[PDB]
Amino acid sequence: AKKEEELQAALARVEEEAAQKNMALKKIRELESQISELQEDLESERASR
Amino acid sequence: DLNLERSHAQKNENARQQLERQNKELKVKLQEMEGTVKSKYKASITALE
């Protein structure tokens, strides 16, 4: 029961950590997309200048 | 008296055996309760920290 109880807690940590990792991964993709759009504006603004 | 004395001696052996049997179970319970408490609480304290 000690290892079984501790195993359930360890498994729950993976699920809890996976939830935060999913949001972090999605935020990284969203932030990366904004960097691409910002880079295009810099090149377009610099080219227009 | 010999037969009656043996009954008391035999009964004492059963009572003495129960104390010895309970001592083995008591030591096993105390040794397991310390691990189940020191482990279930140590891991939980690390998660809160």
Swiss-Prot record, chain A:
The modification Phosphoserine is found at residue 36. Signal peptide: none annotated. ISGylated. Disulfide bonds: none annotated. In the kidney, expressed in the glomeruli. Also expressed in leukocytes. It comes from the Eukaryota. It is found in: Cytoplasm, Cytoskeleton; Cytoplasm, Cell cortex; Cytoplasmic vesicle, Secretory vesicle, Cortical granule; Cell membrane. Belongs to the TRAFAC class myosin-kinesin ATPase superfamily. Myosin family. Myosin is a hexameric protein that consists of 2 heavy chain subunits (MHC), 2 alkali light chain subunits (MLC) and 2 regulatory light chain subunits (MLC-2). Interacts with RASIP1. Interacts with DDR1. Interacts with PDLIM2. Interacts with SVIL. Interacts with HTRA3. Interacts with Myo7a. Interacts with CFAP95. Interacts with LIMCH1; independently of the integration of MYH9 into the myosin complex. Interacts with RAB3A. Interacts with ZBED4. Interacts with S100A4; this interaction increases cell motility. The rodlike tail sequence is highly repetitive, showing cycles of a 28-residue repeat pattern composed of 4 heptapeptides, characteristic for alpha-helical coiled coils. Cellular myosin that appears to play a role in cytokinesis, cell shape, and specialized functions such as secretion and capping. Required for cortical actin clearance prior to oocyte exocytosis. Promotes cell motility in conjunction with S100A4. During cell spreading, plays an important role in cytoskeleton reorganization, focal contact formation (in the margins but not the central part of spreading cells), and lamellipodial retraction; this function is mechanically antagonized by MYH10. It is linked to Macrothrombocytopenia and granulocyte inclusions with or without nephritis or sensorineural hearing loss: An autosomal dominant disorder characterized by thrombocytopenia, giant platelets and Dohle body-like inclusions in peripheral blood leukocytes with variable ultrastructural appearance. Some affected individuals lack leukocyte inclusion bodies on classic staining of peripheral blood smears. Alport syndrome-like features of nephritis, hearing loss, and eye abnormalities are present in some patients. Deafness, autosomal dominant, 17: A form of deafness characterized by progressive high frequency hearing impairment and cochleosaccular degeneration. This is Myosin-9. The chain holds residues 1079 to 1127 of 1960 of the full protein.
